[PDB]
Protein backbone atom coordinates (compact mmCIF):
# COMPACT_ATOMS: atom_id res chain seq x y z
CA UNK A 1 0.00 0.00 0.00
CA UNK A 2 2.96 2.33 -0.45
CA UNK A 3 0.65 4.35 -2.77
CA UNK A 4 0.04 6.49 0.30
CA UNK A 5 3.34 8.32 -0.36
CA UNK A 6 2.63 9.99 -3.72
CA UNK A 7 6.01 9.81 -5.44
CA UNK A 8 6.64 7.58 -8.38
CA UNK A 9 8.69 6.76 -11.42
CA UNK A 10 8.27 6.18 -15.08
CA UNK A 11 9.45 2.76 -16.21
CA UNK A 12 12.04 3.89 -18.71
CA UNK A 13 15.72 4.21 -18.24
CA UNK A 14 18.24 5.47 -15.93
CA UNK A 15 17.39 8.88 -14.86
CA UNK A 16 19.51 11.65 -13.80
CA UNK A 17 22.23 12.13 -16.38
CA UNK A 18 25.74 13.21 -15.78
CA UNK A 19 26.87 16.51 -14.53
CA UNK A 20 28.96 17.05 -17.66
CA UNK A 21 25.81 16.65 -19.73
CA UNK A 22 24.10 19.48 -17.86
CA UNK A 23 26.84 21.97 -18.71
CA UNK A 24 26.57 21.30 -22.40
CA UNK A 25 22.86 21.99 -22.17
CA UNK A 26 23.27 25.11 -20.07
CA UNK A 27 25.97 26.69 -22.21
CA UNK A 28 23.89 26.25 -25.33
CA UNK A 29 20.88 27.97 -23.80
CA UNK A 30 22.94 30.83 -22.42
CA UNK A 31 24.38 31.40 -25.87
CA UNK A 32 20.81 31.24 -27.20
CA UNK A 33 19.58 33.95 -24.85
CA UNK A 34 22.39 36.42 -25.27
CA UNK A 35 22.34 35.73 -29.01
CA UNK A 36 18.62 36.52 -29.08
CA UNK A 37 18.07 33.33 -30.95
CA UNK A 38 19.89 34.18 -34.13
CA UNK A 39 21.65 31.56 -36.14
CA UNK A 40 25.15 32.80 -36.67
CA UNK A 41 26.35 30.95 -39.74
CA UNK A 42 29.54 29.03 -40.30
CA UNK A 43 32.25 30.59 -42.43
CA UNK A 44 32.26 27.83 -45.03
CA UNK A 45 28.51 27.48 -45.60
CA UNK A 46 28.01 29.54 -48.80
CA UNK A 47 25.36 32.14 -47.97
CA UNK A 48 17.74 34.52 -44.00
CA UNK A 49 19.22 38.00 -43.55
CA UNK A 50 21.52 38.17 -40.54
CA UNK A 51 20.64 40.58 -37.71
CA UNK A 52 23.90 42.32 -38.46
CA UNK A 53 25.87 40.47 -41.03
CA UNK A 54 29.52 40.36 -40.11
CA UNK A 55 29.67 37.80 -37.28
CA UNK A 56 30.37 34.17 -38.23
CA UNK A 57 31.86 30.94 -36.97
CA UNK A 58 35.16 29.64 -38.33
CA UNK A 59 36.00 26.01 -39.15
CA UNK A 60 36.74 25.72 -35.46
CA UNK A 61 33.95 26.82 -33.13
CA UNK A 62 35.04 30.37 -32.37
CA UNK A 63 33.13 33.48 -33.41
CA UNK A 64 34.81 35.96 -35.69
CA UNK A 65 34.20 39.43 -37.00
CA UNK A 66 34.97 39.35 -40.65
CA UNK A 67 35.54 43.11 -40.86
CA UNK A 68 37.84 43.50 -37.93
CA UNK A 69 39.38 40.03 -38.06
CA UNK A 70 38.92 39.54 -34.40
CA UNK A 71 38.28 36.25 -32.64
CA UNK A 72 35.76 36.03 -29.86
CA UNK A 73 35.24 33.56 -27.09
CA UNK A 74 31.51 34.02 -26.47
CA UNK A 75 28.47 36.04 -27.42
CA UNK A 76 29.07 38.27 -24.44
CA UNK A 77 32.45 39.23 -25.86
CA UNK A 78 30.97 39.90 -29.29
CA UNK A 79 28.43 42.37 -27.97
CA UNK A 80 31.40 44.14 -26.40
CA UNK A 81 33.04 44.31 -29.79
CA UNK A 82 29.95 45.30 -31.76
CA UNK A 83 29.60 48.03 -29.13
CA UNK A 84 33.26 48.89 -29.40
CA UNK A 85 35.12 51.75 -31.00
CA UNK A 86 37.19 49.58 -33.32
CA UNK A 87 34.21 47.86 -34.91
CA UNK A 88 32.84 51.40 -35.28
CA UNK A 89 35.81 52.53 -37.31
CA UNK A 90 36.02 49.60 -39.69
CA UNK A 91 32.42 50.30 -40.69
CA UNK A 92 33.31 53.93 -41.46
CA UNK A 93 36.42 52.90 -43.38
CA UNK A 94 34.35 50.47 -45.42
CA UNK A 95 31.83 53.34 -45.58
CA UNK A 96 34.35 55.59 -47.30
CA UNK A 97 35.88 52.71 -49.25
CA UNK A 98 32.47 52.08 -50.80
CA UNK A 99 31.62 55.77 -51.21
CA UNK A 100 34.69 56.11 -53.45
CA UNK A 101 33.51 53.41 -55.90
CA UNK A 102 30.50 51.46 -57.20
Amino acid sequence: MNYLEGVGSKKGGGGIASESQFNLQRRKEVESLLSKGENVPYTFQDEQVRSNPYIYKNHSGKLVCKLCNTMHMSWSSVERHLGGKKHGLNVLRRGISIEKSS
Partner: protein, 102 residues
Protein backbone atom coordinates in the same frame (compact mmCIF):
# COMPACT_ATOMS: atom_id res chain seq x y z
CA UNK B 1 -11.57 57.98 -40.28
CA UNK B 2 -11.53 54.94 -40.41
CA UNK B 3 -12.68 51.34 -40.62
CA UNK B 4 -15.39 50.35 -43.09
CA UNK B 5 -18.25 47.91 -42.59
CA UNK B 6 -18.34 44.82 -44.83
CA UNK B 7 -21.17 46.37 -46.83
CA UNK B 8 -19.63 49.60 -48.09
CA UNK B 9 -16.43 47.66 -48.79
CA UNK B 10 -18.39 45.20 -50.91
CA UNK B 11 -19.90 48.05 -52.90
CA UNK B 12 -16.51 49.67 -53.48
CA UNK B 13 -15.06 46.44 -54.84
CA UNK B 14 -18.11 46.01 -57.06
CA UNK B 15 -17.47 49.43 -58.57
CA UNK B 16 -13.77 48.73 -59.00
CA UNK B 17 -14.47 45.60 -61.02
CA UNK B 18 -17.09 47.46 -63.05
CA UNK B 19 -14.48 49.99 -64.14
CA UNK B 20 -11.91 47.32 -64.95
CA UNK B 21 -14.46 45.42 -67.04
CA UNK B 22 -15.50 48.55 -68.92
CA UNK B 23 -11.84 49.08 -69.80
CA UNK B 24 -11.56 45.56 -71.21
CA UNK B 25 -14.60 46.38 -73.33
CA UNK B 26 -13.21 49.68 -74.61
CA UNK B 27 -9.81 48.19 -75.42
CA UNK B 28 -11.58 45.33 -77.20
CA UNK B 29 -13.42 47.98 -79.23
CA UNK B 30 -10.08 49.66 -79.97
CA UNK B 31 -8.40 46.46 -81.16
CA UNK B 32 -11.33 45.94 -83.57
CA UNK B 33 -31.06 33.11 -73.99
CA UNK B 34 -33.42 30.94 -71.93
CA UNK B 35 -34.57 27.44 -72.86
CA UNK B 36 -36.46 25.28 -70.35
CA UNK B 37 -37.19 21.62 -71.03
CA UNK B 38 -40.74 20.33 -71.00
CA UNK B 39 -39.70 17.04 -69.38
CA UNK B 40 -37.81 18.71 -66.53
CA UNK B 41 -37.95 22.35 -65.46
CA UNK B 42 -34.19 22.48 -65.94
CA UNK B 43 -33.29 25.84 -67.48
CA UNK B 44 -30.43 26.25 -69.95
CA UNK B 45 -28.69 29.45 -70.99
CA UNK B 46 -26.61 29.93 -74.15
CA UNK B 47 -23.03 31.01 -73.44
CA UNK B 48 -20.12 32.53 -75.34
CA UNK B 49 -16.97 30.50 -74.72
CA UNK B 50 -15.12 33.78 -74.95
CA UNK B 51 -15.43 36.13 -71.95
CA UNK B 52 -15.78 33.04 -69.85
CA UNK B 53 -12.13 32.16 -70.46
CA UNK B 54 -11.47 35.87 -70.03
CA UNK B 55 -13.31 35.73 -66.70
CA UNK B 56 -11.32 32.75 -65.41
CA UNK B 57 -8.12 34.47 -66.49
CA UNK B 58 -9.18 37.65 -64.70
CA UNK B 59 -9.90 35.86 -61.42
CA UNK B 60 -6.66 33.87 -61.54
CA UNK B 61 -4.67 36.97 -62.44
CA UNK B 62 -6.11 39.09 -59.63
CA UNK B 63 -5.49 36.27 -57.16
CA UNK B 64 -1.88 36.14 -58.30
CA UNK B 65 -1.50 39.89 -57.90
CA UNK B 66 -3.04 39.97 -54.43
CA UNK B 67 -0.98 37.00 -53.27
CA UNK B 68 2.17 38.67 -54.56
CA UNK B 69 1.58 42.11 -53.06
CA UNK B 70 0.82 40.56 -49.69
CA UNK B 71 3.98 38.52 -50.21
CA UNK B 72 6.02 41.68 -50.72
CA UNK B 73 4.59 43.05 -47.47
CA UNK B 74 5.78 39.73 -46.03
CA UNK B 75 9.30 40.42 -47.29
CA UNK B 76 9.65 44.06 -46.24
CA UNK B 77 7.80 43.41 -42.99
CA UNK B 78 10.52 41.16 -41.59
CA UNK B 79 13.50 43.06 -43.02
CA UNK B 80 12.51 46.49 -41.69
CA UNK B 81 12.34 46.14 -37.89
CA UNK B 82 15.50 44.92 -36.13
CA UNK B 83 15.34 46.95 -32.92
CA UNK B 84 14.14 44.75 -30.04
CA UNK B 85 15.40 41.24 -29.22
CA UNK B 86 13.57 38.34 -30.93
CA UNK B 87 14.00 34.57 -30.69
CA UNK B 88 12.14 33.65 -33.90
CA UNK B 89 10.21 35.17 -36.78
CA UNK B 90 6.87 34.61 -35.03
CA UNK B 91 8.08 36.70 -32.08
CA UNK B 92 9.03 39.64 -34.30
CA UNK B 93 5.71 39.37 -36.13
CA UNK B 94 3.83 39.45 -32.83
CA UNK B 95 5.78 42.45 -31.56
CA UNK B 96 4.99 44.28 -34.80
CA UNK B 97 1.34 43.59 -33.92
CA UNK B 98 2.23 45.28 -30.63
CA UNK B 99 3.43 48.18 -32.78
CA UNK B 100 0.00 48.18 -34.43
CA UNK B 101 -1.70 48.21 -31.02
CA UNK B 102 -0.06 51.55 -30.14
Amino acid sequence: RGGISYDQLAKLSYEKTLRNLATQTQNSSKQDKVQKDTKTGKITIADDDKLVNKLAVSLQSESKKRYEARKRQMQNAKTLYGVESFINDKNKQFNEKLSRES
